Design a protein around this ligand. Structure first.
Ligand code: K
Ligand code: K
Lengths: 355, 355, 355, 355
C-alpha cells in the first residue's frame, strides 16, 4: 500500500520470448492446418533459438566480474537452450522434435528472482510436510479401502478393486468432484460425510504450512534487502538499537525510471519517501532538486494536506517509502528528530519556491 | 466485536438503482414474453437514466467546494451514465441496445469506498503475483503437456492436442472438477496425484498474498482515519508517545443516526465509548446529556455490571468504541487516568440522577 | 495444547434430543414403509414434545434469580417448541405436519454459547462484507454477461439467456464444477482462464474476513472470561500492570468433574496449573489436598522431569492451565516470584509425602 | 529458511516397509492375474511380517532403560503387527485375509512424531469445533430440507425425500460439485446463491481453527525443544531475562550427519550457526576444528560477504541456526556481546589459517 514499483519488474527479454515462443507450439499440433504459418513459426523458434544463441556467447563471456561467482544455476539452461533443439532436429526427424519445447519453460525461472525465495524455506519446514504427506497417505488408503469393502458386489466395473476407488478418494478429498462414478447405497455414501470435512481440515493445515513462514521470509526479505540504505542516510547515527527493528519490516524500497512521476501535486498526501540514490524534479518555481540522501512529505503529513510539489523521477532513483503512522511512530519515538522535521516543515516552506 | 455501525452504510441512491436496474435486463432476453412488462421496464431504464441525468447536471455543477479537487474518477461514469444508452438507442436499433446495460455496474463502484483500498495494495505486492503468475503458467504448460504425451493414441477426440488438455489442467488445478473428459489409463491418471496437492499449495500462497497485507491495510485503515479524534479529546495532552500506537489499532469509529439507541439499560455491560461530536440521551431522571468530548461505561466496567443508563442517539454522533481489556490496559498504563475514572466512577453515580 | 476440557461441554439434554428427534423425520418421508415404526416415532416426537413441555413450565417459572434478566432469546423457541406441532397437528391434517420439524433446529442454538460470539463481530466488519458482496455481484454480472455474448448462436437451449449463464458463473467461480453445460468454442472457454483465479482470490479475502478477528474475538474471549480468577490468587497483589496482558491471552480455564484424573504420575511433565476453586487428590502417602487457591507442576518444570503425583479431580475444580515458556517467561519476569517457587520446589519435596 | 535438515528425518525402516508393503495388496485384488507374482508378494508380507517379528522380540526386550517409561503407544501395534495376519491366515481361509492389510498403516504413525503434536491441541480447541460441528449440522438440515420443499413434484426419483437432498447439500456446501442430480426450476436454484458463499465462510473459519494454534504449537514446539542448548553455551550467563523470549521462536535446531557439508566457501553468506555438540571441518590450511560450544558466520555477516571457509560436517553435530536480523538484533541488544564478536571478527581472521 506504500510503494512505487516502476521500471519494468518484468524486464529481461530473456524472460519474454518464452511466452510467444511456446504459443508457436500448438499450431504444429493440429490436423488440416495449412503449411504456410505452420513453418512460419519454426523460424520464430529459430529466432528465439538464434536470439538466446546470440545472447549465449556473450554470457559465455563470463569474464565480466570474474572474481567470485556461482553461475551454474543461471547457465544451466543456456547450455540446453540451444542444444536440445539441435539434436531434436536430427534424431527426431518427425515433427515431434518441437515437443522439446518443454525446455524454455525454465528460462523465466532462470531469472525468476522470488523463485529461490520459494526453495529457501522448503528445506526448513518440509519436516512437517513429510509427516503430513504420510498422514495424507495414511488417510488415503485407510479410507480408500473402505470403498472396496462395499460396492464390489454391484459395481465391479467401477469399484472392482482398490486403486479404482483410491482414485475416487483424492478427487473426493481434494475438493474436486469430477463426476465419473459415485455409489448407489446408503452407508457407502455415509462415509463421505467426514471426508471433505477432513481434507478441508487437512489442506487447511497443509497449504497453511506454505504461507506460514513464506510470509515470514518475505517479511524477512524486506529487511535483508534494507538493512542496506540505513547508514547511507546522514541522520541515522543517533537512532537507538531496537528502533530499527520496529521500522524496517514496513519500509520497502523500489526503483523508479527517469521521466516518471513520483507524487503529483494536489492529490491527497498519504506517504513520504527517503531518497538515497538518484535525483528528482521538485516541481516548484525554483526546482529544489534533491539528489542522494533526502526526503519529502513531512510538509504534507504534519499538516494533513495535499501535495506541495509535483515531484517527478528526473532520473532513476533508489527509493524508500513510508506512511504516516510509522512516521508518527518515529515522531513519537523521539523529540530529537521531530525538531529538524519541525524546522524542515518551515525550511521547505520558503525553500520550496526560493533557492 | 466492539462497534456500532448505524445510519445506512449503503446510503446513496446512486448505488441503489443499479440493482433493480439491471434486473430489468433479463425479461428483454427471453422469447414468448408479453410486450406488456417488456417495455414497462425500458421506462425504468429511462427513469434511472433520467434519475442520474437529473442528478447529473447538479454534479456538473462542480463549483461546490471548488478549491482543490480530483474528481475524474467520480465523474468517469456519470458522463457514460447517460451517453451510452443514447447512441445505443439509435445505432443499435435492434433490442440489443439494452445490452449496454454493461454500464451501470461501475456506478456502485463510483462510490464504493473500500474499493480504492483494494487498488492501493496491488501496486506494492504484485511483484510477487507476477512471478507467481508465471509460476502458475510454469506449472500449467509443464504439466499440461504431459497429457498430450499419452492419450493422443485413443483420445484424439478429447486429447488430440495441447490446449484441449491445458483446459483439463486449470479445471484440474483450480479446485473445480467439471466432468467432461477424464483419462482411462493408469499413469495418465497417476500424474494427477500431485496436482490438486500442488494447486492447493499454490493458491494457499497466491490467495494468501491478498489477505496478507489487505489485513495490514485495513488494520492500517483504522489508524489513518483515527489519528483524528485524538487531540479532540480534552484529556490527551498527557498521553505518552508510544501509548497511542498500542491503542488505535482497535479503536474503530462509526456514526449513529438520531433517534437510535446507543446502549440499553440492564443489558450486560461489555464496552465503553468516547463521544467526540454529537450528543446523547443519558436515560436518567435528570438526563445527563453529554455532547462532544465525553465518554461512558466506566461505571459498568470497573464494577462488572449491567448498564446504568439507556443511552440513546439523540442526534447523529461521531463515536469511538472500546472494550475492557484495552481500557484495563489503559487503566494498567497509568495511575494518572484511573484517578479521574475513579472519581468519575463516583461523580456519575450521583450526577446520573442529579444535575 | 494446554487445557483439560472435561465434564460434558455438550451437557444439556435440551440440546441432545434434537439430534435423534429430527432423524425421526425421514422414515415419514418414504413410500412402501410399514406403519409400525412409522408412528412409533411420532410418539418420540410427542416425547420430545412432552419432554421440553415438561421442561417448559419450570422454565416459565422464571422467578428464579428474578432481579435483572434478558431471556427473550432463550425463551424464543420454548414457546414455539410446543405450539407449532400443535396447530400443525390440526390445520395440517395431512402427514406434512411433521415437516414442521424445521423447528427444533434452533434448540441447540438456544444454548449454543459460541453462537453469540459469531453474531457479535458481524456487526463490526460487515462494512467490508457488503462492499465485497457488491464486488462479488460486480464481478458476477460483468462476467456472467460475457457468456450470453457468445453461445446464444448454437446453445440457445443452455445459454439462450443471461441468468442461465449466471448460474454457470457462481458454480464456476465458487470452486464447484457441477458439470451440466460447458462451452464448445475457443474464446468462450478462454474467459474462464481468470475466473477461478479470481474467485479463489475473492474468497481468499472474503472468507478471510471471517477468521480475521473471529480469532481476535476468541483470543479476546479468553481474556474477558479470565480477568476473573486473577485477584482470587493470593499472590497477585505484586504483579505489575502490563505483566498480565502478556499472559492471559494463553491462560485458558476449564472445569474438570469429580472422580476424574488431573495429571497422571510418571507421564512426561509438560504443564502446570493454578487451582482457584475446588479440590484435588494429590496422590501421595499423605495426600496434600490443596483446595481453592493453589498450583502444581513447578516440581516438574524447573527440573524437566515426569510427574511427582497422580493428581486427580477429587471434586469439580475451576482450573487454569499453563505450559513452561510462559512460566519460564514469568520466572524471567521477576526474581520475586521464582524465590517462592524455588522454596516451593523444596517445600513440596518434603511436604508431598509428609503432612 | 534458516535451517539444515540432514540425516534422514524419515529414518526408521519400521516406517519404510509399510509403503511397499501395502502396494503388495492390489495385485491380489484383480482378476486374470498370473499366480506367479500373485504369491511372490505374499512372501513379501511374510518378510515384513518376519521383519517386524524379527524386530519384535528385541522390542519385547523392553528392559533397556527400564526406570520410568510409558510405551503402551509404541507397542500398541507391534502386538497386532504379527497377530492379525496369523488368525487372518486360518479363520479367513479365503484370500480376503490380505484385507487385514488395514493394519500396518499405523506403523508409520507408531513413530510419526509430529502426530502427537496434532492430538495435543484438539483437546483445547474442539470446544469450538463441536459448536461449529453443530452449526454445520444446523445449516445442513435447515437448508437440506429446503430442497424437499420443491422438486418432490417432478423429481421424486432424485429428490423424493430428505436425505437424498442432504446428499446434495454437503457436496454443494463442501466445495465439490459431483454432478449427479441438479434442479430444473428457478427458486430451487436460487437457494444455492448463498450456499457456497456460506460453506466457504464456514470452512474459512472451521479449517481456520486448525492452523490457528497449530502454528502456535509448532511455534511453541520450537521453544520447548530449545530452552535446551541455552545454558550449554558458555557465554549465556549474562543474557537478560526477556532477551531469550525474543529469540528462541526462530532458533531451530537440527542434526547433520558425518561427512556432509555445513556451508560451502564462496557461496553468499546469509546465516550463522551455534555449535553445541559435535565437531566440524573448518576448511582452511590449519583446520580450526571447533567442537561442542562454538559458532561461525560473524566473519560473513558483519562484513556482508561470502563464506570464509567450506565448513563441513566432520561428525554428527547438534546445530542451531540463525540469520542476520536476529543477530543484528542481538548485536543491537547489547554492546557487551558485539565486543567479543568484534574481537572474534579479528581473531578468526588470523586464527582461520593459523593455529
Ligand atoms: K470442486
Ligand atoms: K463435476
Amino acid at each position: 500500500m506504500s510503494v512505487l514499483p516502476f521500471l519494468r519488474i518484468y524486464a529481461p527479454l530473456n524472460a519474454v520470448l518464452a511466452a510467444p515462443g511456446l504459443l508457436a507450439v500448438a499450431a504444429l499440433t493440429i490436423p488440416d492446418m495449412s503449411g504456410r504459418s505452420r513453418l512460419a513459426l519454426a523460424a520464430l523458434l529459430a529466432v528465439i533459438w538464434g536470439a538466446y544463441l546470440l545472447q549465449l556467447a556473450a554470457t559465455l563471456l563470463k569474464r565480466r566480474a570474474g572474481v567470485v561467482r556461482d553461475r551454474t544455476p543461471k547457465i544451466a539452461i543456456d547450455v540446453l537452450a540451444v542444444l536440445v533443439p539441435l539434436a531434436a532436429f536430427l534424431l527426431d526427424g518427425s515433427p515431434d522434435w518441437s515437443l522439446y519445447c518443454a525446455v524454455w519453460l525454465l528460462k523465466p525461472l532462470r531469472d525468476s528472482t522470488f523463485f529461490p525465495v520459494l526453495g529457501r524455506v522448503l528445506a526448513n519446514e518440509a519436516r512437517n510436510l513429510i509427516g503430513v504427506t504420510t498422514l495424507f497417505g495414511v488417510v488415503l488408503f485407510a479410507v480408500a479401502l473402505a470403498a472396496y469393502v462395499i460396492e464390489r458386489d454391484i459395481q465391479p466395473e467401477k469399484f472392482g478393486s482398490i486403486p479404482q476407488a483410491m482414485w475416487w478418494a483424492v478427487v473426493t478429498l481434494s475438493t474436486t468432484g469430477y463426476g465419473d462414478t459415485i455409489p448407489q447405497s446408503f452407508a457407502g455414501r455415509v462415509l463421505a460425510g467426514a471426508v471433505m470435512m477432513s481434507g478441508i481440515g487437512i489442506f487447511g493445515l497443509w497449504a497453511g504450512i506454505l504461507a506460514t513462514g513464506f510470509y515470514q521470509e518475505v517479511r524477512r526479505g524486506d529487511f535483508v534487502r534494507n538493512w542496506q540504505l540505513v547508514a547511507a542516510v546522514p541522520l541515522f547515527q543517533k537512532l537507538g538499537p531496537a528502533v530499527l527493528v520496529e521500522i524496517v519490516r514496513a519500509l520497502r524500497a523500489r526503483t523508479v525510471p527517469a521521466g516518471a512521476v513520483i507524487c503529483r501535486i494536489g492529490e491527497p498526501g498519504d506517504r513520504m519517501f527517503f531518497v538515497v540514490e538518484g535525483s528528482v524534479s521538485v516541481a516548484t518555481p525554483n526546482p529544489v532538486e534533491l539528489g542522494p540522501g533526502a526526503f519529502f512529505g513531512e510538509m504534507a503529513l504534519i499538516s494533513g494536506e495535499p501535495r506541495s510539489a509535483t515531484v517527478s523521477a528526473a532520473t532513476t532513483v533508489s527509493l524508500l517509502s513510508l506512511h504516516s503512522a510509522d512516521f508518527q511512530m518515529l515522531c513519537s519515538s523521539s523529540p530529537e528528530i521531530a525538531e529538524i522535521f519541525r524546522k524542515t516543515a518551515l525550511e521547505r516552506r520558503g525553500a520550496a519556491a526560493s533557492a
